[PDB]
Scaffold this motif. Sequence first.
Motif, mmCIF file in Angstrom:
data_model
loop_
_atom_site.group_PDB
_atom_site.id
_atom_site.type_symbol
_atom_site.label_atom_id
_atom_site.label_comp_id
_atom_site.label_asym_id
_atom_site.label_seq_id
_atom_site.Cartn_x
_atom_site.Cartn_y
_atom_site.Cartn_z
ATOM 1 N N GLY A 12 0.854 -1.202 0.000
ATOM 2 C CA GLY A 12 0.000 0.000 0.000
ATOM 3 C C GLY A 12 0.860 1.211 0.000
ATOM 4 O O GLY A 12 2.010 1.141 0.323
ATOM 5 N N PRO A 13 0.286 2.345 -0.251
ATOM 6 C CA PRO A 13 0.902 3.620 -0.337
ATOM 7 C C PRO A 13 1.797 4.018 0.829
ATOM 8 O O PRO A 13 2.862 4.590 0.659
ATOM 9 C CB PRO A 13 -0.278 4.648 -0.527
ATOM 10 C CG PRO A 13 -1.518 3.839 -0.242
ATOM 11 C CD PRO A 13 -1.165 2.383 -0.213
ATOM 12 N N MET A 14 1.317 3.898 2.010
ATOM 13 C CA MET A 14 2.250 4.166 3.096
ATOM 14 C C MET A 14 3.517 3.294 3.057
ATOM 15 O O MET A 14 4.460 3.701 3.371
ATOM 16 C CB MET A 14 1.552 3.972 4.404
ATOM 17 C CG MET A 14 2.527 4.328 5.560
ATOM 18 S SD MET A 14 1.635 4.000 7.154
ATOM 19 C CE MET A 14 2.788 4.303 8.589
ATOM 20 N N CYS A 15 3.492 2.084 2.630
ATOM 21 C CA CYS A 15 4.703 1.335 2.444
ATOM 22 C C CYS A 15 5.588 2.081 1.406
ATOM 23 O O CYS A 15 6.824 2.173 1.551
ATOM 24 C CB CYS A 15 4.356 -0.049 1.974
ATOM 25 S SG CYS A 15 5.735 -1.029 1.827
ATOM 26 N N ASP A 16 4.973 2.535 0.331
ATOM 27 C CA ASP A 16 5.778 2.903 -0.765
ATOM 28 C C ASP A 16 6.589 4.070 -0.336
ATOM 29 O O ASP A 16 7.853 4.033 -0.538
ATOM 30 C CB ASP A 16 4.952 3.316 -1.980
ATOM 31 C CG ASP A 16 4.441 2.134 -2.741
ATOM 32 O OD1 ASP A 16 4.998 0.934 -2.701
ATOM 33 O OD2 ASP A 16 3.375 2.436 -3.319
ATOM 34 N N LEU A 17 5.882 5.134 0.134
ATOM 35 C CA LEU A 17 6.459 6.389 0.464
ATOM 36 C C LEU A 17 7.751 6.053 1.260
ATOM 37 O O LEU A 17 8.805 6.575 1.015
ATOM 38 C CB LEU A 17 5.477 7.142 1.351
ATOM 39 C CG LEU A 17 4.313 7.804 0.578
ATOM 40 C CD1 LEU A 17 3.092 8.259 1.343
ATOM 41 C CD2 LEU A 17 4.851 8.987 -0.218
ATOM 42 N N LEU A 18 7.667 5.105 2.178
ATOM 43 C CA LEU A 18 8.744 4.801 3.107
ATOM 44 C C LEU A 18 9.922 3.919 2.517
ATOM 45 O O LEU A 18 11.076 3.838 2.990
ATOM 46 C CB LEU A 18 8.030 4.142 4.342
ATOM 47 C CG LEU A 18 7.303 5.072 5.386
ATOM 48 C CD1 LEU A 18 7.033 4.397 6.722
ATOM 49 C CD2 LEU A 18 7.836 6.559 5.574
ATOM 50 N N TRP A 19 9.563 3.245 1.430
ATOM 51 C CA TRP A 19 10.337 2.085 0.914
ATOM 52 C C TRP A 19 10.904 1.941 -0.582
ATOM 53 O O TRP A 19 11.957 1.340 -0.752
ATOM 54 C CB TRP A 19 9.670 0.782 1.391
ATOM 55 C CG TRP A 19 9.800 0.455 2.784
ATOM 56 C CD1 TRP A 19 8.899 0.663 3.706
ATOM 57 C CD2 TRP A 19 10.872 -0.346 3.406
ATOM 58 N NE1 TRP A 19 9.274 0.046 4.858
ATOM 59 C CE2 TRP A 19 10.494 -0.576 4.695
ATOM 60 C CE3 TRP A 19 12.031 -0.958 2.944
ATOM 61 C CZ2 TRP A 19 11.252 -1.320 5.549
ATOM 62 C CZ3 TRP A 19 12.761 -1.650 3.792
ATOM 63 C CH2 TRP A 19 12.388 -1.824 5.085
ATOM 64 N N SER A 20 10.168 2.392 -1.578
ATOM 65 C CA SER A 20 10.476 2.310 -2.968
ATOM 66 C C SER A 20 11.713 3.090 -3.436
ATOM 67 O O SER A 20 12.223 3.964 -2.788
ATOM 68 C CB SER A 20 9.251 2.747 -3.786
ATOM 69 O OG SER A 20 8.859 4.120 -3.629
ATOM 70 N N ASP A 21 12.209 2.706 -4.592
ATOM 71 C CA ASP A 21 13.430 3.277 -5.167
ATOM 72 C C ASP A 21 13.068 3.585 -6.561
ATOM 73 O O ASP A 21 12.275 2.905 -7.138
ATOM 74 C CB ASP A 21 14.680 2.292 -5.114
ATOM 75 C CG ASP A 21 14.960 1.762 -3.658
ATOM 76 O OD1 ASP A 21 15.599 2.546 -2.831
ATOM 77 O OD2 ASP A 21 14.417 0.672 -3.271
ATOM 78 N N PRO A 22 13.724 4.555 -7.156
ATOM 79 C CA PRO A 22 13.693 4.743 -8.630
ATOM 80 C C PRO A 22 14.482 3.721 -9.313
ATOM 81 O O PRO A 22 15.513 3.336 -8.703
ATOM 82 C CB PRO A 22 14.428 6.098 -8.847
ATOM 83 C CG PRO A 22 15.231 6.333 -7.661
ATOM 84 C CD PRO A 22 14.487 5.613 -6.470
#
Length: 315
Positions: free
Chosen positions: A204-214
Amino acid sequence: YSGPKLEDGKVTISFMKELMQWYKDQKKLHRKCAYQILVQVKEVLSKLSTLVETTLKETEKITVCGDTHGQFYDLLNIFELNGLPSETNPYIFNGDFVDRGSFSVEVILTLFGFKLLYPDHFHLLRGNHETDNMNQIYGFEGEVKAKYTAQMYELFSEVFEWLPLAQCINGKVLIMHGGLFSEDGVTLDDIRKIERNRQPPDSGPMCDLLWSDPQPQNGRSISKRGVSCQFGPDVTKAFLEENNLDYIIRSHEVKAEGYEVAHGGRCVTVFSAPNYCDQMGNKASYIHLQGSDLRPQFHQFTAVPHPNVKPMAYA
Ligand SMILES: [Zn+2]
Ligand SMILES: [Zn+2]
Protein backbone atom coordinates in the motif's frame (compact mmCIF):
# COMPACT_ATOMS: atom_id res chain seq x y z
CA TYR A 1 22.91 16.07 37.55
CA SER A 2 24.46 19.42 36.22
CA GLY A 3 23.34 18.42 32.69
CA PRO A 4 21.05 20.52 30.44
CA LYS A 5 17.47 21.30 31.62
CA LEU A 6 14.29 22.63 30.30
CA GLU A 7 13.35 26.15 31.19
CA ASP A 8 9.70 25.98 32.38
CA GLY A 9 9.43 22.52 30.90
CA LYS A 10 9.78 23.71 27.39
CA VAL A 11 12.79 23.71 25.05
CA THR A 12 14.83 26.68 24.31
CA ILE A 13 17.61 27.69 22.08
CA SER A 14 20.16 27.58 24.89
CA PHE A 15 18.98 24.25 26.17
CA MET A 16 19.70 23.14 22.64
CA LYS A 17 23.24 24.64 22.55
CA GLU A 18 23.44 23.01 25.72
CA LEU A 19 22.19 19.55 24.61
CA MET A 20 24.59 19.72 21.68
CA GLN A 21 27.57 20.45 23.90
CA TRP A 22 26.53 17.75 26.37
CA TYR A 23 26.08 15.30 23.52
CA LYS A 24 29.33 16.28 21.90
CA ASP A 25 30.84 15.29 25.12
CA GLN A 26 29.18 11.80 25.19
CA LYS A 27 27.08 12.52 28.32
CA LYS A 28 23.32 11.63 28.68
CA LEU A 29 20.30 13.85 28.77
CA HIS A 30 18.34 13.12 31.94
CA ARG A 31 15.46 10.73 31.54
CA LYS A 32 12.84 13.20 32.48
CA CYS A 33 14.09 15.73 29.92
CA ALA A 34 14.20 12.84 27.40
CA TYR A 35 10.66 11.96 28.49
CA GLN A 36 9.28 15.57 28.40
CA ILE A 37 10.47 16.32 24.87
CA LEU A 38 9.25 12.96 23.57
CA VAL A 39 5.75 13.74 25.02
CA GLN A 40 5.76 17.13 23.83
CA VAL A 41 6.61 16.34 20.32
CA LYS A 42 4.08 13.37 20.19
CA GLU A 43 1.74 16.21 20.71
CA VAL A 44 3.00 18.62 18.16
CA LEU A 45 3.57 15.98 15.44
CA SER A 46 0.30 14.29 16.12
CA LYS A 47 -1.93 17.02 15.01
CA LEU A 48 -0.01 17.18 11.89
CA SER A 49 -1.40 16.32 8.51
CA THR A 50 0.02 13.27 7.02
CA LEU A 51 1.03 15.51 4.08
CA VAL A 52 2.77 18.61 5.22
CA GLU A 53 2.11 21.70 2.99
CA THR A 54 4.56 24.55 3.10
CA THR A 55 5.04 27.72 1.14
CA LEU A 56 8.43 29.33 0.61
CA LYS A 57 7.75 33.04 -0.07
CA GLU A 58 9.90 34.71 -2.67
CA THR A 59 12.90 35.49 -0.48
CA GLU A 60 12.95 32.56 2.03
CA LYS A 61 15.16 29.46 1.38
CA ILE A 62 14.85 25.93 3.19
CA THR A 63 17.49 23.16 3.46
CA VAL A 64 16.43 19.50 2.89
CA CYS A 65 18.79 16.69 4.26
CA GLY A 66 18.16 12.97 3.98
CA ASP A 67 19.39 10.09 6.04
CA THR A 68 21.52 10.84 8.94
CA HIS A 69 21.17 7.38 10.72
CA GLY A 70 22.92 8.24 14.08
CA GLN A 71 25.93 9.91 12.75
CA PHE A 72 25.38 12.82 15.27
CA TYR A 73 28.84 14.38 14.79
CA ASP A 74 28.14 14.65 11.15
CA LEU A 75 24.79 16.14 12.15
CA LEU A 76 26.59 18.84 14.08
CA ASN A 77 28.91 19.22 11.15
CA ILE A 78 25.68 19.96 9.03
CA PHE A 79 24.80 22.73 11.47
CA GLU A 80 28.25 24.21 11.56
CA LEU A 81 28.40 24.55 7.71
CA ASN A 82 24.92 25.65 7.10
CA GLY A 83 23.82 27.31 10.31
CA LEU A 84 21.52 26.36 13.15
CA PRO A 85 17.92 25.75 12.51
CA SER A 86 15.92 28.86 13.18
CA GLU A 87 12.93 30.53 11.74
CA THR A 88 15.07 31.79 8.99
CA ASN A 89 17.11 28.86 8.27
CA PRO A 90 14.40 26.09 8.13
CA TYR A 91 15.31 22.40 7.76
CA ILE A 92 13.60 19.34 6.42
CA PHE A 93 15.10 15.97 7.59
CA ASN A 94 13.77 13.35 5.25
CA GLY A 95 13.96 10.39 7.80
CA ASP A 96 16.27 7.61 8.69
CA PHE A 97 17.44 9.46 11.74
CA VAL A 98 18.05 6.35 13.66
CA ASP A 99 19.66 3.06 13.11
CA ARG A 100 23.04 1.75 12.22
CA GLY A 101 24.83 4.78 13.75
CA SER A 102 25.96 4.50 17.36
CA PHE A 103 24.71 8.10 18.47
CA SER A 104 21.06 7.63 17.44
CA VAL A 105 19.80 8.72 20.76
CA GLU A 106 21.87 11.96 20.33
CA VAL A 107 20.54 12.39 16.84
CA ILE A 108 16.91 12.00 17.63
CA LEU A 109 16.52 14.06 20.69
CA THR A 110 18.57 16.91 19.04
CA LEU A 111 16.19 16.52 16.15
CA PHE A 112 12.96 16.48 18.32
CA GLY A 113 14.37 19.42 20.38
CA PHE A 114 14.66 21.65 17.33
CA LYS A 115 11.18 20.41 16.36
CA LEU A 116 9.88 21.58 19.61
CA LEU A 117 11.87 24.84 19.24
CA TYR A 118 11.00 25.65 15.68
CA PRO A 119 7.72 23.81 14.88
CA ASP A 120 6.82 25.70 11.71
CA HIS A 121 10.42 25.91 10.36
CA PHE A 122 12.09 22.50 11.16
CA HIS A 123 10.57 19.48 9.55
CA LEU A 124 10.84 15.86 10.23
CA LEU A 125 9.48 13.22 7.81
CA ARG A 126 9.31 9.65 8.62
CA GLY A 127 11.94 7.24 7.43
CA ASN A 128 11.68 3.56 6.98
CA HIS A 129 14.03 3.33 10.07
CA GLU A 130 11.46 5.18 12.33
CA THR A 131 9.59 1.80 12.70
CA ASP A 132 9.79 -1.12 15.19
CA ASN A 133 11.23 -3.53 12.81
CA MET A 134 14.23 -1.77 11.51
CA ASN A 135 14.56 -0.65 15.17
CA GLN A 136 14.71 -4.33 16.61
CA ILE A 137 17.52 -5.32 14.19
CA TYR A 138 19.67 -2.13 13.28
CA GLY A 139 20.46 -0.66 16.63
CA PHE A 140 18.06 1.92 17.75
CA GLU A 141 16.37 -0.27 20.31
CA GLY A 142 19.45 -1.81 21.71
CA GLU A 143 20.69 1.73 21.90
CA VAL A 144 17.72 3.05 23.79
CA LYS A 145 17.60 0.04 26.12
CA ALA A 146 21.20 0.64 26.97
CA LYS A 147 21.01 4.25 27.75
CA TYR A 148 17.46 4.34 29.11
CA THR A 149 14.88 1.41 29.13
CA ALA A 150 12.34 -0.55 27.04
CA GLN A 151 9.77 1.86 28.31
CA MET A 152 11.68 4.78 26.87
CA TYR A 153 11.92 2.79 23.52
CA GLU A 154 8.22 2.20 23.23
CA LEU A 155 7.68 5.73 23.92
CA PHE A 156 10.03 6.60 20.92
CA SER A 157 8.00 4.24 18.82
CA GLU A 158 4.70 5.88 19.56
CA VAL A 159 6.26 9.14 18.74
CA PHE A 160 7.63 8.06 15.42
CA GLU A 161 4.29 6.70 14.51
CA TRP A 162 3.08 10.45 14.25
CA LEU A 163 5.80 11.67 12.01
CA PRO A 164 4.20 13.10 8.77
CA LEU A 165 4.76 10.79 5.79
CA ALA A 166 5.66 13.54 3.10
CA GLN A 167 5.87 17.36 2.58
CA CYS A 168 5.23 19.37 -0.57
CA ILE A 169 6.65 22.95 -1.11
CA ASN A 170 4.66 25.59 -3.15
CA GLY A 171 2.69 22.62 -4.64
CA LYS A 172 5.72 22.35 -6.88
CA VAL A 173 8.18 20.00 -5.02
CA LEU A 174 7.30 16.92 -3.05
CA ILE A 175 9.68 15.15 -0.51
CA MET A 176 9.36 11.77 1.04
CA HIS A 177 11.95 9.32 2.23
CA GLY A 178 11.63 6.34 -0.14
CA GLY A 179 9.56 7.25 -3.21
CA LEU A 180 6.55 6.87 -5.43
CA PHE A 181 3.99 4.19 -5.79
CA SER A 182 3.42 0.53 -6.45
CA GLU A 183 0.17 1.31 -8.26
CA ASP A 184 -0.64 4.25 -10.38
CA GLY A 185 -3.13 7.06 -9.89
CA VAL A 186 -1.95 8.06 -6.49
CA THR A 187 -2.59 11.78 -5.71
CA LEU A 188 -1.72 14.33 -2.93
CA ASP A 189 -5.28 14.10 -1.66
CA ASP A 190 -4.61 10.36 -1.13
CA ILE A 191 -1.43 10.97 0.97
CA ARG A 192 -3.23 13.43 3.18
CA LYS A 193 -5.80 10.68 4.24
CA ILE A 194 -3.25 7.96 4.87
CA GLU A 195 -4.05 7.01 8.52
CA ARG A 196 -0.26 7.10 9.39
CA ASN A 197 -0.22 6.19 13.09
CA ARG A 198 0.89 2.57 12.84
CA GLN A 199 3.83 0.45 11.85
CA PRO A 200 3.68 0.61 7.98
CA PRO A 201 1.80 -2.15 6.37
CA ASP A 202 3.47 -4.77 3.92
CA SER A 203 2.34 -2.80 0.81
CA GLY A 204 0.00 0.00 0.00
CA PRO A 205 0.90 3.62 -0.34
CA MET A 206 2.25 4.17 3.10
CA CYS A 207 4.70 1.34 2.44
CA ASP A 208 5.78 2.90 -0.76
CA LEU A 209 6.46 6.39 0.46
CA LEU A 210 8.74 4.80 3.11
CA TRP A 211 10.34 2.08 0.91
CA SER A 212 10.48 2.31 -2.97
CA ASP A 213 13.43 3.28 -5.17
CA PRO A 214 13.69 4.74 -8.63
CA GLN A 215 14.96 2.63 -11.45
CA PRO A 216 16.40 3.88 -14.77
CA GLN A 217 14.41 1.73 -17.29
CA ASN A 218 10.59 2.70 -17.82
CA GLY A 219 8.10 0.62 -15.62
CA ARG A 220 7.97 -1.07 -12.19
CA SER A 221 10.15 -3.94 -10.67
CA ILE A 222 9.86 -5.77 -7.47
CA SER A 223 12.30 -4.07 -5.06
CA LYS A 224 15.55 -5.71 -4.55
CA ARG A 225 14.88 -4.97 -0.90
CA GLY A 226 11.84 -7.41 -0.26
CA VAL A 227 9.04 -4.67 -0.06
CA SER A 228 7.50 -1.96 -2.26
CA CYS A 229 9.03 -1.61 -5.79
CA GLN A 230 11.40 0.40 -8.07
CA PHE A 231 9.52 2.87 -10.19
CA GLY A 232 10.73 4.04 -13.59
CA PRO A 233 10.82 7.35 -15.28
CA ASP A 234 7.45 6.89 -16.79
CA VAL A 235 6.01 6.29 -13.16
CA THR A 236 7.46 9.62 -11.97
CA LYS A 237 6.38 11.55 -15.01
CA ALA A 238 2.82 10.10 -14.70
CA PHE A 239 2.52 11.15 -10.98
CA LEU A 240 3.96 14.61 -11.59
CA GLU A 241 1.37 15.22 -14.25
CA GLU A 242 -1.63 14.13 -12.15
CA ASN A 243 -0.57 16.16 -9.27
CA ASN A 244 0.79 19.25 -11.02
CA LEU A 245 4.33 18.97 -9.44
CA ASP A 246 7.93 19.92 -10.62
CA TYR A 247 9.74 17.01 -9.22
CA ILE A 248 10.45 14.97 -6.19
CA ILE A 249 13.22 14.85 -3.58
CA ARG A 250 13.62 11.54 -1.72
CA SER A 251 16.52 9.73 0.13
CA HIS A 252 16.90 6.18 1.30
CA GLU A 253 19.85 5.02 -0.73
CA VAL A 254 23.59 6.06 -0.21
CA LYS A 255 25.42 7.83 -2.92
CA ALA A 256 29.11 8.18 -3.61
CA GLU A 257 28.60 12.02 -4.08
CA GLY A 258 25.67 12.49 -1.68
CA TYR A 259 23.03 13.13 -4.37
CA GLU A 260 21.94 11.76 -7.64
CA VAL A 261 19.47 13.23 -10.17
CA ALA A 262 17.46 10.45 -11.87
CA HIS A 263 14.50 10.50 -14.17
CA GLY A 264 15.67 13.26 -16.25
CA GLY A 265 15.74 15.85 -13.54
CA ARG A 266 12.53 14.53 -12.05
CA CYS A 267 13.58 12.42 -9.04
CA VAL A 268 16.47 13.76 -6.79
CA THR A 269 18.27 11.76 -4.04
CA VAL A 270 19.88 13.62 -1.15
CA PHE A 271 21.50 11.45 1.65
CA SER A 272 23.14 13.15 4.55
CA ALA A 273 25.06 10.55 6.45
CA PRO A 274 28.56 10.68 5.12
CA ASN A 275 31.08 7.89 5.02
CA TYR A 276 27.90 6.01 5.92
CA CYS A 277 28.61 3.49 8.72
CA ASP A 278 32.38 4.54 8.75
CA GLN A 279 32.68 2.43 5.65
CA MET A 280 31.57 3.66 2.33
CA GLY A 281 33.71 6.51 1.71
CA ASN A 282 30.77 8.53 0.65
CA LYS A 283 30.12 11.99 0.32
CA ALA A 284 26.92 13.45 1.72
CA SER A 285 25.30 16.81 0.95
CA TYR A 286 22.21 18.69 1.51
CA ILE A 287 20.09 20.83 -0.74
CA HIS A 288 19.05 24.50 -0.63
CA LEU A 289 15.85 25.40 -2.48
CA GLN A 290 14.76 28.98 -2.34
CA GLY A 291 11.46 30.59 -2.63
CA SER A 292 11.81 32.08 -6.12
CA ASP A 293 13.63 29.26 -7.92
CA LEU A 294 12.82 25.91 -6.42
CA ARG A 295 15.59 24.26 -8.26
CA PRO A 296 17.99 22.26 -6.24
CA GLN A 297 21.33 23.54 -5.27
CA PHE A 298 23.51 20.67 -3.84
CA HIS A 299 26.01 21.36 -1.13
CA GLN A 300 28.57 18.58 -0.49
CA PHE A 301 30.32 17.83 2.80
CA THR A 302 32.24 14.96 4.27
CA ALA A 303 32.54 13.08 7.57
CA VAL A 304 34.31 14.62 10.69
CA PRO A 305 36.02 12.68 13.55
CA HIS A 306 33.60 10.97 16.08
CA PRO A 307 34.37 9.17 19.18
CA ASN A 308 35.42 5.46 19.14
CA VAL A 309 32.09 3.81 19.34
CA LYS A 310 31.55 1.19 16.53
CA PRO A 311 28.65 1.26 13.97
CA MET A 312 25.91 -1.07 15.02
CA ALA A 313 27.40 -1.28 18.57
CA TYR A 314 23.87 -1.51 20.14
CA ALA A 315 22.24 -4.21 18.00
ZN1 LIG B 1 15.73 4.27 4.21
ZN1 LIG C 1 18.82 4.87 5.01
